[PDB]
Design a binder for this molecule. Structure first.
Ligand SMILES: [Mg+2]
Ligand SMILES: [Mg+2]
Lengths: 395, 395
């Protein structure tokens, strides 16, 4: 009885005492059998959502409409679910009828309070063999929910399982059905597929199956995806960096339109381009300039080099260290630190408040950062003065 | 800085460090200022749902669509909410614009990381004066959501605040608007209103305001409600017992149709009847009979006597003690304990399996429970035998 379940045992135990019968189902089970670290433990029971909210003090209705209720037990969230058969939804009392609705064998295992594995569908073999197989007719399933084909590729990314001959086949055959699923639900899948320690072979597959050309911006990029294999995906730390590379490997032009089609939140789509851009502008890690670095701000700067590593093959280490070094040598790290404010430049150059002011400060920092003049009021003054009569000798 | 908030401080603290600005808003605040034990601490912020799910490890999307996200911090659930103006919903950055959307003054208070109360709407005075006042035009508010009038009466139940002259007035005027709100949402409100330490005066009000005659089964019972005042509501322990009494005080006939209209879950509407029934059947606490008790099974039995107390004025104490005493003297406490099963009566009276069997066993327990015959196989046998030739001397 590994600690993940140990704690959550209570929930089962309690639901059983009130005469209900419940099981650990789900990834948690697979993850145990497979020997991955165990993430969320999930419980399913014959107890109806209400009965669940009656027995446990802290409850959190998430969707009692489809039989799910989150139960805060001993300071951890647990997803409790009333057995169901995907039609509205129908509640039953048969564990077996519930698992039979699950997506792929390796998911439809279950384990009881005593630790006794209940694999009625071969999950257990699927996991030994490291294979993704559909629970029932690979075809029929995909018809009910096309997104199921998405996840299949995803799982390949997160687990390094291989598709099943029949499963894989079916996908290609029913690929089109995808254009019916909301973009949203497509994003999240693609999102996980990209952090896969196997993404390196997930993306290719995405093309070798029909699935390509029904996903936003991935029209006919077949070639590009397969080539993607080489990219060192796994070192991508964060979301932006991920999408960043997704582009650069699809030889994408304008970042903005594309990433937006995937209905990603703005901040991402912006910071995505940010890097992509900075990446195109600086082609070599030696060439980062006090300016560009200052502009891009440490975080991004590093994220660039990493995206870059993800492509070159070169490890960031040395760069990341160097960047972090310089960044603390920049005699200013944000504009707010500038010794000298816009109203200082006005009272100084006897000129009315305008657009010329931007340009001014915009050249005072670029001059502080580049170590031309100190970041002290007095000195920036002379500096600006003696530079303005120079623009009278130049024209 | 009282412990309930002390712990949740972390959340604010972290959201501020990422440049967002958040506050304890809600009942928590009211409860502090009022001096009640503090229930759920609620946080609202300018950080958008996503930013919230980015910063905290364990998140639980409940409804990011309306700006709410549950954040499990240090082993407790906290309802975090992006500031909003009730239109779909519009997110802002002004705390003030958020509180301005809250139902009643006493709710629209807020407190900052340093413990500095922000009452921009008189909540703080409302709490001193112990009054329920609408945030803005009592009329306009009720038009947006009629249920707001419900809560108003509820709060009276939970708090013992009085309605505001203008608030109260408005309710009667816009009473009708209620029939537009889903029954579901009406039940929950009624539910809380019944557990009120001031329910005793909440139900009356419910009638003195239009609000009566738009709520299920509460058509023209005006009289009944006001009289309700006398009932010792507050000793009601559980849900059934509550509804039980709600009936008995409205002089309700058939429990089943009524309670159902309030879309209460079956188990309740059954156990409600259960008591209401056993209550009509046994009019005095001395009269419980081994049979009846055995039938109703300790729990309900007590629940009867309490519901009764809630009405008579007599304290349960002595009865609840006496019931609990007998119930362990009943020589059986369920039918499952019966020494003798139905297949025993068949191989015994050489007759084919039928309906006469029920009637048999159904008189063997009734005879065990009443202490006529032991609950041993042998002895029940003779007893059954020697009683069956008696049904030959009788006709
Ligand atoms: Mg968990
Ligand atoms: Mg809480």
């Amino acid at each position: 009885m590994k600690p993940p379940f140990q704690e959550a045992l209570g929930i089962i135990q309690q639901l059983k005492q009130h005469g209900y019968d419940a099981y650990f189902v789900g990834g948690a089970v697979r993850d145990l059998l497979l020997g991955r670290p165990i993430g969320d433990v999930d419980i399913a029971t014959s107890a109806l959502p209400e009965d669940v909210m009656a027995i446990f003090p802290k409850t959190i209705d998430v969707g009692s409409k489809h039989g799910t209720v989150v139960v805060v037990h001993k300071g951890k969230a647990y997803e409790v679910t009333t057995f169901k058969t995907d039609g509205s939804v129908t509640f039953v009392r048969s564990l077996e009828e519930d698992l039979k609705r699950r997506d792929f064998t390796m998911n439809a295992i279950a384990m009881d309070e005593y630790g006794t594995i209940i694999d009625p569908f071969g999950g257990r073999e699927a996991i030994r063999r490291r294979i993704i197989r559909t629970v029932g007719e690979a075809e029929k399933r995909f018809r009910e929910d096309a997104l199921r084909m998405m996840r299949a590729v995803r799982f390949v990314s997160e687990l390094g399982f291989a598709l099943a001959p029949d499963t894989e086949q079916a996908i290609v055959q029913n690929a089109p059905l995808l254009a019916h699923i909301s973009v949203e639900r497509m994003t999240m899948e693609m999102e996980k597929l990209l952090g896969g320690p196997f993404a390196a072979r997930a993306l290719p597959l995405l093309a070798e199956t029909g699935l390509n050309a029904y996903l936003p911006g991935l029209a006919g990029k077949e070639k590009q995806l397969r080539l993607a294999a080489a990219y060192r995906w796994p070192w991508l730390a964060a979301r932006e960096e991920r999408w960043a590379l997704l582009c650069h490997a699809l030889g994408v032009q304008e970042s903005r339109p594309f990433l937006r089609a995937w209905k990603l939140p703005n901040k991402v789509v912006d910071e995505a381009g940010a890097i992509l851009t900075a990446l195109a502008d600086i082609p070599r890690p030696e060439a980062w300039t006090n300016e560009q670095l200052f502009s891009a701000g440490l975080e991004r700067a590093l994220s660039v080099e990493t995206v870059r590593a993800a492509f070159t093959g070169a490890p960031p280490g040395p760069w990341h260290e160097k960047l972090r070094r310089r960044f603390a040598s920049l005699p200013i790290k944000t504009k707010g630190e500038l010794a000298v404010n816009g109203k200082d430049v006005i009272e100084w150059v006897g000129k009315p408040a305008g657009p010329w002011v931007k340009e001014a400060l915009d050249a005072i920092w670029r001059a502080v950062v580049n170590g031309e003049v100190e970041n002290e009021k007095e000195r920036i003054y002379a500096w600006l003065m003696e530079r303005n009569r120079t623009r009278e000798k130049n024209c």
